Amino acid sequence: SNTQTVLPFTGLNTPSGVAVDSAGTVYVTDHGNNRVVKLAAGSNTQTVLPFTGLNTPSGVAVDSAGTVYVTDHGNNRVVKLAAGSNTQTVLPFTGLNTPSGVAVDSAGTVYVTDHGNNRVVKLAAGSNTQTVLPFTGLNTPSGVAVDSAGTVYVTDHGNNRVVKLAAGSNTQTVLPFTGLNTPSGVAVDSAGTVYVTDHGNNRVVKLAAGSNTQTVLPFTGLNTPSGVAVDSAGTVYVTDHGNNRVVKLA
Amino acid sequence: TQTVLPFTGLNTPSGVAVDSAGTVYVTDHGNNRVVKLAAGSNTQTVLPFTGLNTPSGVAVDSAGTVYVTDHGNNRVVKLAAGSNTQTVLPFTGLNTPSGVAVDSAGTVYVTDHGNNRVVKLAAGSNTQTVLPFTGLNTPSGVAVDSAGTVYVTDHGNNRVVKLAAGSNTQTVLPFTGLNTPSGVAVDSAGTVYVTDHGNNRVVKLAAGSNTQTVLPFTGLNTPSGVAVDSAGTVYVTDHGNNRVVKLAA
Ligand SMILES: [Cu+2]
Ligand SMILES: [Cu+2]
Ligand SMILES: [Cu+2]
Ligand SMILES: [Cu+2]
Ligand SMILES: [Cu+2]
Ligand SMILES: [Cu+2]
Ligand SMILES: [K+]
Ligand SMILES: [K+]
Numbered sequence: 001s002n003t004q005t006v007l008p009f010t011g012l013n014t015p016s017g018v019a020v021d022s023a024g025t026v027y028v029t030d031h032g033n034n035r036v037v038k039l040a041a042g043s044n045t046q047t048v049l050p051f052t053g054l055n056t057p058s059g060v061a062v063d064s065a066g067t068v069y070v071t072d073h074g075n076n077r078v079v080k081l082a083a084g085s086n087t088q089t090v091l092p093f094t095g096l097n098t099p100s101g102v103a104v105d106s107a108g109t110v111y112v113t114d115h116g117n118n119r120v121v122k123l124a125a126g127s128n129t130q131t132v133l134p135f136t137g138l139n140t141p142s143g144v145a146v147d148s149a150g151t152v153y154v155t156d157h158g159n160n161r162v163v164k165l166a167a168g169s170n171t172q173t174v175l176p177f178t179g180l181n182t183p184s185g186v187a188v189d190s191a192g193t194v195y196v197t198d199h200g201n202n203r204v205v206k207l208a209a210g211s212n213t214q215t216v217l218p219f220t221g222l223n224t225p226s227g228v229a230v231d232s233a234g235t236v237y238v239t240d241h242g243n244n245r246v247v248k249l250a
Numbered sequence: 251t252q253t254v255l256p257f258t259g260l261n262t263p264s265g266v267a268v269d270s271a272g273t274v275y276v277t278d279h280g281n282n283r284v285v286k287l288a289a290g291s292n293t294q295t296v297l298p299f300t301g302l303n304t305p306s307g308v309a310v311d312s313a314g315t316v317y318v319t320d321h322g323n324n325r326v327v328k329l330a331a332g333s334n335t336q337t338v339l340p341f342t343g344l345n346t347p348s349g350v351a352v353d354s355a356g357t358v359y360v361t362d363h364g365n366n367r368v369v370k371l372a373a374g375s376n377t378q379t380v381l382p383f384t385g386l387n388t389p390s391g392v393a394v395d396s397a398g399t400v401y402v403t404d405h406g407n408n409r410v411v412k413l414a415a416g417s418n419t420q421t422v423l424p425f426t427g428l429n430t431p432s433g434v435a436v437d438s439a440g441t442v443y444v445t446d447h448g449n450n451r452v453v454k455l456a457a458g459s460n461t462q463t464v465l466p467f468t469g470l471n472t473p474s475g476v477a478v479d480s481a482g483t484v485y486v487t488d489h490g491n492n493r494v495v496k497l498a499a
């Protein structure tokens with residue numbers, strides 16, 4: 001499909017991240033409004049999630065159990081909200097400096113890009129101490145994604161590249177993306193396709209698994225894309241920072 | 251023709267400033283430090299600032315005193331030129347501040363970006379005052395001219411807003427085609443310079459004029475800050491290229 005639609009979100013001020021669950025519900029972090037809103041599939045009235053004390057929400061992720069994870073830029077913390085609960089929980093991350101992205105794998109492990117510390121940290125389910133991923137040369141990590149094989153994908157803002165790291169591997173590889181200008185967000189589907197928002201180019205590129213030729217998705221009117229998500233049906237959701245809107249493309 | 255300044259080891263720089271002596275100050279944001287370069291020099295010096303957390307803004311007054319926006323620590327640090335005396339300005343309730351500026355009277359203006367407001371502190375004062383701006387949306391840059399008029403980049407509204415001294419009625423500068431602007435600077439002749447960050451260009455608007463001009467910059471990649479000296483020379487931080495570019499004007 002080459003025709004995008006604008007999700008009926010209202011009152012958006014600088015959308016920063018986007019996530020989608022199994023039921024099609026789209027979660028969006030509202031940077032300028034210090035809130036996280038969600039919109040059910042087909043619905044037109046968004047609801048505000050019962051988060052408390054948010055300061056510049058930068059990234060969002062949702063697991064299979066409906067738990068919503070949010071990186072709090074202004075508070076240097078990561079909070080989570082279980083399904084049906086109205087009491088958030090601050091994950092026991094430490095030493096965070098401007099958390100920019102969040103991802104959760106099949107085992108419940110939470111991955112967080114540490115913008116100010118040039119590192120990616122992860123926290124196993126129920127663990128109290130974090131571990132640092134063996135990435136090297138990261139310049140301002142901005143986004144993170146993890147596929148079904150445990151491979152972690154990270155957008156290198158300051159290096160205009162996307163690096164990946166297989167599970168249990170200490171050798172990182174640079175994805176064959178071309179012409180990248182300030183990558184901001186990253187997402188990967190169950191088929192291995194990597195989707196990356198190009199902040200400096202106002203475009204969204206994708207790269208199939210094992211491919212060396214990227215493809216620019218036919219999004220229109222993009223102004224500073226900040227986040228990207230992909231659902232079960234392959235629809236790509238993109239937060240339009242400059243336009244205060246969220247678009248989707250089938 | 252433009253000139254690249256011999257700065258070394260820059261990592262995602264944000265702010266830029268220049269004093270009367272032509273010394274250029276830049277905020278090395280990715281290195282949590284502020285370095286300066288004297289006019290005609292190629293050896294930079296690191297300012298004695300300490301504990302900076304993701305700093306963004308930088309300004310310099312007549313006496314050479316340097317002000318930096320400690321963005322990650324929600325404060326503004328002052329460094330006197332005479333002694334090594336450092337002082338955290340008594341600002342209150344700051345939330346992710348971005349811009350900083352200072353006028354001839356020593357009043358420091360800081361863009362409280364997270365609160366969509368601009369607050370000022372008089373020289374030697376402990377009580378801050380919120381400027382009567384209305385409808386600011388994620389503002390980034392702030393500047394002040396000789397007459398005390400405060401200029402702010404309404405980054406979320408893609409516009410530049412000014413407010414005269416004593417004025418409580420703001421006016422929108424007739425800029426066109428702005429896309430997520432970041433920095434603002436003001437010269438002696440009342441010319442406002444704005445970094446069109448989303449367009450990789452630097453635009454300017456003379457006093458009273460309603461149409462703008464684009465500065466002949468080349469190879470700009472996501473610019474952040476802008477500064478102007480006495481001779482009209484424009485300095486811009488090529489943030490995406492980790493460099494500071496000078497254009498004689
Ligand atoms: Cu950058
Ligand atoms: Cu940074
Ligand atoms: Cu910040
Ligand atoms: Cu903001
Ligand atoms: Cu913006
Ligand atoms: Cu940008
Ligand atoms: K954003
Ligand atoms: K953000």
Ligand SMILES: [K+]
Nearest residue numbers: 058073099100
């Ligand atoms: K961020």
Ligand SMILES: [K+]
Nearest residue numbers: 100115141142
């Ligand atoms: K970021």
Ligand SMILES: [K+]
Nearest residue numbers: 142157183184
């Ligand atoms: K980014």
Ligand SMILES: [K+]
Nearest residue numbers: 184199225226
């Ligand atoms: K962005």
